[PDB]
Ligand binder design. Structure first.
Ligand SMILES: OC[C@H]1O[C@H](O[C@H]2[C@H](O)[C@@H](O)[C@@H](O[C@H]3[C@H](O)[C@@H](O)[C@@H](O[C@H]4[C@H](O)[C@@H](O)[C@@H](O[C@H]5[C@H](O)[C@@H](O)[C@@H](O[C@H]6[C@H](O)[C@@H](O)[C@@H](O[C@H]7[C@H](O)[C@@H](O)[C@H](O)O[C@@H]7CO)O[C@@H]6CO)O[C@@H]5CO)O[C@@H]4CO)O[C@@H]3CO)O[C@@H]2CO)[C@H](O)[C@@H](O)[C@@H]1O
Ligand SMILES: OC[C@H]1O[C@H](O[C@H]2[C@H](O)[C@@H](O)[C@@H](O[C@H]3[C@H](O)[C@@H](O)[C@@H](O[C@H]4[C@H](O)[C@@H](O)[C@@H](O)O[C@@H]4CO)O[C@@H]3CO)O[C@@H]2CO)[C@H](O)[C@@H](O)[C@@H]1O
Ligand SMILES: OC[C@H]1O[C@H](O[C@H]2[C@H](O)[C@@H](O)[C@@H](O[C@H]3[C@H](O)[C@@H](O)[C@@H](O[C@H]4[C@H](O)[C@@H](O)[C@@H](O)O[C@@H]4CO)O[C@@H]3CO)O[C@@H]2CO)[C@H](O)[C@@H](O)[C@@H]1O
Ligand SMILES: OC[C@H]1O[C@H](O[C@H]2[C@H](O)[C@@H](O)[C@@H](O[C@H]3[C@H](O)[C@@H](O)[C@@H](O)O[C@@H]3CO)O[C@@H]2CO)[C@H](O)[C@@H](O)[C@@H]1O
Ligand SMILES: [Ca+2]
Ligand SMILES: [Ca+2]
Ligand SMILES: [Ca+2]
Length: 686
């Protein structure tokens, strides 16, 4: 199958995601609607259930709404069973219409539908070449109060109907009991509750094994991807172990929700996206887009900086899920604003690197403040809006033009209000021009592109006041006027002679696992795949065609490898770096080091005898470790994903910048559990 196939669960870069807030999309089955105080058919009380369900989605898939838009993937509310409690938050009734208050990760939310309904959804979607992504929030169960168990459902957790435990009398310690987070520190945000939500304790073997078993059920149900909620609030080490569980079973494209504010650039965020085993929702991208196109708080130079910076900060920038708004921020379109702002932001996003996601209703110019005013029922299913047609014209390009899906990004023309950027992949090119200035046209002269000589029609057909482009030799464009609020797209595709890797996924797995290598110019006959210097050919290459390769990871030592391929003739491709071969199945282990005193600015890290521990290289050490919540300084702790059943040697380090102080004495030793969790407690050796 080709890289663009709906069967490709490892690569969403050629897709366009449509984010669906299930309850607010389409009530296809009134029979499953909640009743009484938990319900409002009119959807006037946005904190109640409105009736939107999976049948509705199926209907909207079958009637051409999504497909007509060029949508090729959907991201839906967390499908798992939520609490049925109607929570009164100071005079206002609230329901789990949003799906984020889980009670049983192995059952469905009856308001959305049954397991049978879910299967029907998967089938209907797939039949229409639409991939299905589910929100998954293993961070917590639901709102709770230990002192008052009668509040809500006391964050109770069930296992396919079997009560595991609740927030009150949590003898098992399934949850954390460290109060609520104040978002002051990462550690604080991880080991304390989000709001009043019962924080799951992933160091608890039951919880760990349960959640990993739960996701398997959904993977078995045929999901094509996962949107991990509140990833900044779960141990990064545990999440890597979760991603390993997924990847070592049935790998599916996964991205986490890690909020970033205006002008916020987080190295931690980058590191997470770079080493966790999942990508992220591109908040950096979205916030900048809003500043430039919506709020006018930065100009095209800021947009360009974000593009160049992000391309350098993210190992796999093409896996980042972009967007212009969502269920947690005001809707992009301000009721009083000019619609061209939203249309341009849309066009920009659809043609930019990464994986574009469109919040349901954006195409209908929905306006709304913060939660829940931004979660109103989609008021129309009209295909006649300008925004609908924009998506309709550009979405398909991600499929037909690999430059848009995998291409680099380069600024070709720029001023305060104008940005003309180029996407390039192999023999494929796309040039996009955007003039944010709604009042002033710009004179474009001196534009140089990689487009071959010729005349290029605006892919938008002038919908956004675009124009035709005339390119001479050397890729020089004839002078032209970029209309006020003008947005244009010119593109060119052609066969690529040299094997060119555009994408690889998953990016972290143990040997034997099958990975997907997408691009162009691979040729029809099997070639060779390289994991570092190790060459793989023949049988272990399950399938090989021009745009996609399926190959099993060879049994090489755990570590980070550069992936490369060569066609049957021996011609090598570019290198796709950062591939992590695990040392085997993973388990999440908590490392605790006692009496490790330090100086302000200097932190304790963990290093060990396996790649998961950085193989004794302090530059690849795990940390910095935590010392505030679960354990207090001078005791440090951290949750780490390590190879199950392996006997591992380790030591702790103190680091100040790049300067490192090693523990004295002999290495510590322990053997990782074969499944579940473990806590290794040792003293700092001077
Ligand atoms: O020994 C003393 C005492 O200890 C214990 O009590 C402590 C609690 O254990 C502890 O959790 C802590 O809770 C307090 C919070 O720290 C504090 O913030 C406050 O919480 C308020 C909150 O401040 C309010 O804003 C309000 O929250 C609203 C949100 O503002 C809304 O936006 C909305 O939200 C929900 C969204 O609608 C959902 O979509 C979803 O969000 C998801 C995102 O959409 C998604 O993108 C992302 O991926 O994931 C998100 C999460 O899944 O969920 C959101 C959260 O539900 O709705 C909420 C809720 O109305 O209300 C809360 C609660 O009033 O107050 C908390 C209570 O004090 O501090 C306690 C005291 O120290 C014991 O429990 C107790 O018995 C003991 O007496
Ligand atoms: O934003 C969160 C913080 O995260 C990082 O802070 C780290 C420090 O870099 C570590 O050095 C360590 O801090 C220890 C400190 O090393 C230790 O000496 C002790 O600090 C005393 C200190 O001796 C005394 O002079 C006075 O300042 O009181 C301090 C508090 O007792 O204890 C510290 C831990 O409490 O750990 C923290 C993480 O907790 C980051 O570098 C910081 O910017 C940031 O604040
Ligand atoms: O592959 C080569 C070798 O790899 C393995 O060695 C590991 C060790 O097992 C780790 O302990 C670590 O070594 C640290 C050491 O723990 C630390 O004390 C420090 O050693 C200093 C020492 O304190 C000081 O007294 C003096 O002797 O200098 C030493 C440094 O040379 O620093 C060590 C790291 O530099 O890391 C190494 C790998 O680097 C394996 O055990 C070996 O068999 C193998 O040869
Ligand atoms: O080798 C020629 C020339 O190439 C490169 O310049 C290009 C700029 O990088 C690119 O921004 C664009 O420049 C336009 C400005 O963006 C715009 O504001 C206005 O000033 O017109 C410019 C074009 O006339 O195009 C040029 C190429 O024409 C390279 O950066 C230069 O060093 C080099 O001289
Ligand atoms: Ca319904
Ligand atoms: Ca947590
Ligand atoms: Ca890379």
């Amino acid at each position: 199958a080709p890289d663009t196939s709906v069967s490709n669960k490892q690569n969403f870069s050629t897709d366009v995601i449509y984010q669906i807030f299930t309850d607010r999309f389409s009530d296809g089955n009134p029979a499953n609607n909640p009743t009484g105080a938990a319900f409002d058919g009119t959807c006037t009380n946005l904190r109640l259930y409105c009736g939107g369900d999976w049948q509705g989605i199926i209907n909207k898939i079958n009637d051409g709404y999504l497909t007509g838009m060029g949508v090729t993937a959907i991201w839906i509310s967390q499908p798992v069973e939520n609490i049925y409690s109607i929570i009164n938050y100071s005079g206002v009734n609230n329901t789990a219409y949003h799906g984020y208050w889980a009670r049983d990760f192995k059952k469905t939310n009856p308001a959305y539908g049954t397991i049978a309904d879910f299967q029907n959804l998967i089938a209907a979607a797939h039949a229409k070449n639409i991939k299905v992504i589910i929100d998954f929030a293993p961070n917590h169960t639901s709102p709770a109060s230990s002192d008052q168990p009668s509040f809500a459902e006391n964050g109770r957790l069930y296992d396919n109907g079997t009560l595991l435990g609740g927030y009150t009398n949590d003898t098992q310690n399934l949850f954390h009991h460290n109060g609520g987070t104040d978002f002051s520190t990462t550690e604080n945000g991880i080991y304390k509750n989000l709001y009043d939500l019962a924080d799951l304790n992933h160091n608890n073997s039951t919880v760990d094994v349960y959640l990993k078993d739960a996701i398997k059920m959904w993977l078995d149900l045929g999901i094509d991807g996962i949107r991990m909620a509140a990833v900044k609030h779960m141990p990064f080490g545990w999440q890597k172990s979760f991603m390993a569980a997924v990847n070592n079973y049935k790998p599916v494209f996964t991205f986490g929700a890690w909020f970033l504010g205006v002008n916020e650039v987080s190295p931690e965020n980058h590191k997470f996206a770079n080493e966790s085993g999942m990508s992220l929702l591109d908040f950096r991208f979205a916030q900048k887009v809003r500043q430039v196109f919506r709020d006018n708080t930065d100009n095209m130079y800021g947009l360009k900086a974000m593009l160049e910076g992000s391309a350098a900060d993210y190992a796999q920038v093409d896996d980042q899920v972009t967007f212009i708004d969502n269920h947690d921020m005001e809707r992009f379109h301000a009721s009083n604003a000019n619609r061209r702002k939203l249309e341009q932001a849309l066009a920009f996003t659809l043609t930019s690197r990464g994986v574009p996601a469109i919040y349901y209703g954006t195409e209908q110019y929905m306006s709304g403040g913060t939660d829940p005013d931004n979660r109103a029922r989609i008021p129309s299913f009209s295909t006649s809006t300008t925004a609908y047609q924009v998506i309709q014209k550009l979405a398909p390009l991600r499929k037909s033009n690999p430059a848009i899906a995998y291409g680099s990004t380069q600024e070709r023309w720029i001023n305060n209000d104008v940005l003309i950027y180029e996407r390039k992949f192999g023999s494929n090119v796309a040039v996009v021009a955007v003039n944010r200035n709604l009042n002033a046209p710009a004179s474009i002269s001196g534009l140089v592109t990689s487009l071959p000589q010729g005349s290029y029609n605006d892919v938008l057909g002038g919908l956004l006041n675009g124009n035709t482009l005339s390119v001479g030799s050397g890729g020089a464009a004839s002078n032209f006027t970029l209309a006020a609020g003008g947005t244009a797209v010119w593109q060119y595709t052609a066969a690529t002679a040299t094997p060119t890797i555009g994408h690889v996924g998953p990016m972290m797995a143990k040997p034997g696992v099958t990975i997907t290598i997408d691009g162009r110019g691979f040729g029809s006959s099997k070639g060779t795949v390289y994991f570092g210097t190790t060459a793989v050919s023949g049988a272990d290459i399950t399938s090989w065609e021009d745009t996609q390769i399926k190959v099993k990871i060879p049994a090489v030592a755990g570590g980070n490898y550069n992936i490369k391929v060569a066609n049957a003739a021996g011609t090598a491709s570019n290198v796709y770096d950062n591939f992590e071969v695990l040392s085997g199945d993973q388990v999440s282990v908590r490392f605790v080091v006692n009496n490790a005193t330090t100086a302000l600015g200097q932190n304790v890290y963990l290093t060990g005898s396996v790649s998961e521990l950085g193989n004794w290289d302090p530059a690849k050490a795990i940390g910095p470790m935590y010392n505030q919540v679960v354990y207090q300084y001078p005791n440090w702790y951290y949750d780490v994903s390590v190879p199950a059943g392996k006997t591992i040697e380790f030591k702790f380090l103190k680091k100040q910048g790049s300067t490192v102080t090693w523990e004295g004495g002999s290495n510590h030793t322990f053997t990782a559990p074969s499944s579940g969790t473990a806590t290794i407690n040792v003293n700092w050796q001077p």
